[PDB]
């Protein structure tokens, strides 16, 4: 009965239908099962970089046990998820922790080898109760005889920072290397996960969304790993779309919020007894008017669309990938096609002459938004030289301003 108090039940939740579906990864679950059913030292440890799916495999094994796809030895085994945090809760006295540990071990042993314990992030088991090495290695006699099974899973570099420093305990563990999947596999994963999200957020999701997410999340976000940085885009897109099925969409709610601030400023700046703030007001009014025009236009266009956007598509994902890691990944939604066609004449406002070099920079900027340049190569690498005072540094500073509206936003180093 100590188990009932110091651990939860995984297989029970698997029966009650509360674990996400698990797709693919057949070799890994096969190896986990065959290691989990050998004579001595049956303790598989899923190891590998963070995010690639290591708890998902154990959940898949649990659902598989509930279904019946397991061999004979693993029929009705009742996986158990330990918890060493709630075990060291209040034990300030001398034996209060070893007592609980002995109780749990005894109740695991009393069962006829049924229980399959599961310690998630087992790199925390090392220094369980310190004071002088005594605790956390009381299970070391039972690991060897294979009484308790203990399928665990830790990240790849907290296994050689915490455990491999304890070569006597690493010996009792078998490593199952979980490498990350490819884009073709991630698409398949998403195709089966595209229902829980689609039901939690009251929306629908096109298959093009899944494809484009699994591709862009690999092309751009080069700091995480694949089964997760692809689910995040889908999830945020769906949440945003549900937020817009509220009263108003974006790009109308932003303009009205701007208009309100401009109004509350123009109403309280009017009663200013000065002469220099007269011109500092003469522009604020014009701005308020030119913004209210846009508000009214958008509001009228919405009415037309509503009398004459309900699922996420392959471009809302681009909006997310642009809002996070501000690389523009869109599809030229008419806001800036005119701008990129005017680029030369616009960079002419600050630089004069050297059309032979302005056109060369503009072409490299242009053929990258249309999706034609090499996706794994810099967006352009020019070295323009010539005599002094001509304008080379000036063109470089004009380009950064035309792109980000702040010449202090580019990275400059003086070689």
Strands 79-81 and 116-118: parallel
Options 3-11, 16-24, 75-83, 271-279: segment touching ligand AGS (CB under 6 A): 16-24
For residues 200 and 222, what is the distance between their CA atoms, to the nearest angstrom?
Answer: 29
For residues 280 and 343, what is the distance between their CA atoms, to the nearest angstrom?
Answer: 31
Residue 352 in the binding site for ligand AGS (CB under 6 A): yes
For ligand AGS, the closer of residues 128 and 193 by Cβ is 193
Token pair belonging to 214? 């699994």
For other proteins, the closer of residues 94 and 349 by Cβ is 94
For residues 291 and 256, what is the distance between their CA atoms, to the nearest angstrom?
Answer: 9
Task: Classify residue 214 as exposed, middle or buried by CB count within 10 Å of its CB (0-12, 13-18, 19+).
Answer: buried
Tell me if residue 171 falls in helix, strand or coil: coil
What's the gap between Cα 260 and its chain centre? 35
For residues 121 and 54, what is the distance between their CA atoms, to the nearest angstrom?
Answer: 10
For other proteins, the closer of residues 22 and 58 by Cβ is 22
Residue 218 in the binding site for ligand AGS (CB under 6 A): no
248 binds, among ligand AGS, other proteins, none (CB under 5 to 8 A by kind): none
Site for ligand AGS in 21-50 (CB under 6 A): 22-25, 40, 50
Which of 394, 392, 339 lies closest to 365 in space, CA to CA? 339
326 is in an annotated binding site: no
Residue 56 in the binding site for ligand AGS (CB under 6 A): yes
- Output the CA–CA distances (angstroms, integers) from residue 364 to 256, 333, 395, 400, 405, in the order listed: 37, 20, 14, 14, 19
Position of minimal CB gap to ligand AGS: 53
Task: Classify residue 386 as exposed, middle or buried by CB count within 10 Å of its CB (0-12, 13-18, 19+).
Answer: exposed
List of residues contacting other proteins (CB under 8 A): 23-24, 26-27, 30-31, 33-35, 37-41, 71-72, 93-96, 98-99, 102, 131-134, 137-138, 140-141, 144, 156, 160-161, 167-168, 171, 174, 177, 182, 188, 191-192, 206-208, 211, 332, 337, 340-341, 363, 366-367, 369-375
For other proteins, the closer of residues 382 and 404 by Cβ is 382
263 binds, among other proteins, ligand AGS, none (CB under 5 to 8 A by kind): none
For other proteins, the closer of residues 182 and 393 by Cβ is 182
Token pair belonging to 199? 């039901």
Task: Classify residue 205 as exposed, middle or buried by CB count within 10 Å of its CB (0-12, 13-18, 19+).
Answer: buried
Residue 361 in the binding site for ligand AGS (CB under 6 A): no
For other proteins, the closer of residues 48 and 391 by Cβ is 48
**E strand residue ranges, 195-322:** 204-205, 311-312
Options 69-77, 223-231, 233-241, 267-275: segment touching ligand AGS (CB under 6 A): 223-231
Binding residues for ATP, by number, are 48-55, 386-393
Given the rule CB under 6 A, which residues bind ligand AGS?
A: 20, 22-25, 40, 50-56, 144, 155, 168, 171, 189, 193, 227-228, 231, 351-353, 388-394
């Amino acid at each position: 009965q100590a188990l009932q108090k110091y651990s939860t039940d995984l297989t029970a939740r698997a029966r009650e239908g509360k674990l996400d579906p698990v797709i693919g990864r057949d070799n890994e679950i096969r190896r986990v099962v065959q290691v989990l059913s050998r004579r001595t030292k049956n303790n598989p440890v899923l190891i590998g970089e963070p995010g690639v799916g290591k708890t998902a495999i154990v959940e898949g094994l649990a659902q598989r046990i509930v279904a019946g796809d397991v061999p004979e030895s693993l029929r009705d085994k009742t996986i158990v998820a330990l918890d060493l945090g709630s075990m060291v809760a209040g034990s300030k006295y001398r034996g209060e922790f070893e007592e609980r540990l002995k109780a749990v071990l005894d109740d695991i042993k009393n069962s006829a080898g049924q229980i399959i314990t599961f310690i998630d992030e087992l790199h925390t088991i090392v220094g369980a109760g310190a004071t002088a090495m005594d605790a956390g290695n009381m299970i070391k006699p039972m690991l060897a005889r294979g009484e308790l099974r203990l399928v665990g899973a830790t990240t790849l570099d907290e296994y050689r920072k915490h455990i491999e420093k304890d070569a006597a305990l690493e010996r009792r563990f078998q490593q199952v290397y979980v490498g990350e999947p490819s884009v073709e596999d991630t698409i398949g994963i998403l195709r089966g996960l595209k229902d829980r999200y689609e039901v939690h957020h009251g929306v629908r999701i096109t298959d093009s969304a899944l494809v484009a997410a699994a591709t862009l999340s690999d092309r751009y976000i080069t700091a995480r790993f694949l089964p997760d940085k692809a689910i995040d885009l889908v999830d945020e897109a769906a949440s945003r779309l549900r937020m817009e099925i509220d009263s108003r969409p974006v790009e109308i709610d932003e303009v009205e919020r701007l208009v309100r601030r401009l109004e509350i400023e123009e109403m309280a700046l009017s009663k200013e007894e000065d002469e220099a703030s007269a011109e500092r007001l003469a522009k604020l009014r014009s701005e308020l008017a030119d913004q209210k025009e846009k508000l009214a236009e958008l509001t009228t266009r919405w009415q037309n669309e509503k009398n004459a956007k309900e699922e996420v598509g392959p471009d809302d994902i681009a909006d997310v990938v642009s809002a996070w890691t501000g690389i523009p990944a869109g599809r030229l939604l008419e806001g800036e096609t005119a701008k990129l066609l005017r680029m030369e004449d616009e960079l002419g406002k600050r630089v004069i002459g050297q059309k032979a070099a302005v056109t060369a920079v503009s072409d490299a900027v242009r053929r990258s938004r249309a999706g034609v340049s090499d996706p794994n190569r810099p967006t352009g690498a020019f070295m323009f030289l010539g005599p002094t005072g001509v304008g080379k540094t000036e063109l470089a500073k004009a380009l950064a301003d035309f792109l980000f509206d702040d010449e202090r936003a580019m990275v400059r180093i003086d070689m």
